[PDB]
Design a protein around this ligand. Structure first.
Ligand SMILES: *[C@@H]1O[C@H](CO)[C@@H](O[C@@H]2O[C@H](CO)[C@@H](O[C@@H]3O[C@H](CO[C@@H]4O[C@H](CO)[C@@H](O)[C@H](O)[C@@H]4O)[C@@H](O)[C@H](O[C@H]4O[C@H](CO)[C@@H](O)[C@H](O)[C@@H]4O[C@@H]4O[C@H](CO)[C@@H](O)[C@H](O)[C@@H]4O)[C@@H]3O)[C@H](O)[C@H]2NC(C)=O)[C@H](O)[C@H]1NC(C)=O
Ligand SMILES: *[C@@H]1O[C@H](CO)[C@@H](O[C@@H]2O[C@H](CO)[C@@H](O)[C@H](O)[C@H]2NC(C)=O)[C@H](O)[C@H]1NC(C)=O
Ligand SMILES: *[C@@H]1O[C@H](CO)[C@@H](O)[C@H](O)[C@H]1NC(C)=O
Lengths: 134, 109, 48
């Protein structure tokens, strides 16, 4: 049971940091790899990015790279932050896993394939509103 | 969203909007309203464990048929939102999850 | 063989109007998914 427990402040103001966690339990953390998802009411889903073993952060080009996504092993937590939060971000943030699936369609020797990042296990999500209130 | 209507006890075909140019890898998702979603079929054929046979995938013939979600025998648990997520060879990294496909079944007991 | 190639190639279509500025762009989104494929848009005189 990898219950991806998400816990954020729940009330934020514009141009600060949102701190939502993502717990790993009932199973190890270094064995597999985890990531983050988000979606908004009225709109569709919006993945935030991916953190892998090399810890280099792949970012969303449509969000202007104004987030701080990371991960720490000590307290078994996924550390996602959003610096400079715009008032448009009043929505819910999810958790998700990620199995790095290797899609073959050509020859491996020439780099004639690509990697599809499939996700299986998700979280529940906490909705945080951002405005002059905190 | 595109509202769609179907009957009960009928095989359902679900196709997403943008076309499948190049070899494609479709993923399906079950966004039941309010709570967390779950996937139906990934890799265009591999249904994950815990998914009943009422949800069937679409094999690839390298062309022709679009991303179709075969659904035989909708029940009182299928009133939800269905999402078409696909990886082709022309969109490169298919960053986007694409548009939202809606269904609202009528004649539901 | 030289003469036969020239003779079989003589009556076919001349391509002198292809000499024209080619507004040409890359086709490939992902890096090195395939150059080696150039999508060139240009001008060409029609029947009239
Ligand atoms: C010349 O040198 C090349 C060097 O690579 C030799 O290999 C070529 O590349 C690969 C590897 O050998 C093969 O083609 C690909 O094969 C995969 C399947 O690989 C599997 O590997 C197993 C061992 O690891 C083996 O036991 C299996 O039998 C199998 O070979 C295949 O998935 C690739 O095609 C995918 O994409 C196509 C579109 O681009 C689709 O049409 C395919 O269906 C497939 O996609 C999946 O299809 C599933 C359904 O079938 C579907 O469920 C899923 O979602 C996907 O859509 C690709 O065919 C070949 O062996 C070889 N390729 C070619 C073109 O030759 C090569 O053998 C050697 N000699 C020659 C004569 O070329
Ligand atoms: C074919 O010839 C026409 C000649 O006008 C080209 O037209 C110009 O194209 C440039 C861009 O390349 C534009 O900035 C100009 O405004 C165009 N002029 C007119 C009057 O339309 C045309 O581009 C050529 N074909 C291609 C494929 O470039
Ligand atoms: C575009 O075309 C140029 C032509 O010189 C090539 O160098 C380049 O790699 C191509 N692709 C990109 C992404 O610029």
């Amino acid at each position: 049971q990898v219950q991806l427990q998400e816990s954020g402040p729940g009330l934020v103001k514009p141009s600060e940091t949102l701190s939502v966690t993502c717990s790993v339990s009932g199973d190890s953390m270094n064995n597999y790899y985890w990531t983050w998802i988000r979606q908004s009411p009225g709109k569709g889903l919006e993945w935030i990015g991916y953190i892998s073993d090399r810890e280099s952060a792949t970012y969303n080009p449509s969000l202007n790279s104004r987030v701080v996504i990371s991960r720490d092993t000590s307290k078994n937590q996924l550390s996602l932050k959003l610096n400079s939060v715009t008032p448009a971000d009043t929505a819910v943030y999810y958790c998700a896993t990620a199995r790095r699936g290797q899609r073959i369609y050509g020859v491996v020797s020439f780099g004639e394939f690509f990697y599809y990042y499939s996700m299986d296990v998700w979280g529940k999500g906490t909705t945080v509103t951002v405005s002059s209130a905190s | 969203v595109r509202p769609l209507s179907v009957a009960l006890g009928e095989t359902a075909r679900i196709s997403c909007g943008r076309q499948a140019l190049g070899s494609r890898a479709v993923q399906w998702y079950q966004h039941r309203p309010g709570q967390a979603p779950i996937l139906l079929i990934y890799n265009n054929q591999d249904r994950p464990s815990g998914i009943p046979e009422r949800f069937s995938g679409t094999p690839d013939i390298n062309f022709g048929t679009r991303a179709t979600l075969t659904i035989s025998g909708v029940e009182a648990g299928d009133e939800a939102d269905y999402y078409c997520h696909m990886w082709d060879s022309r969109s490169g990294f298919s960053w986007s999850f694409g548009g939202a496909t809606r269904l609202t079944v009528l004649g539901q007991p | 063989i030289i003469s036969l190639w020239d003779q079989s190639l003589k009556p076919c279509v001349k391509l002198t109007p292809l000499c024209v500025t080619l507004q040409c762009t890359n086709v490939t989104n992902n890096i090195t998914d395939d150059g080696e494929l150039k999508n060139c848009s240009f001008n060409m005189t029609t029947e009239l």
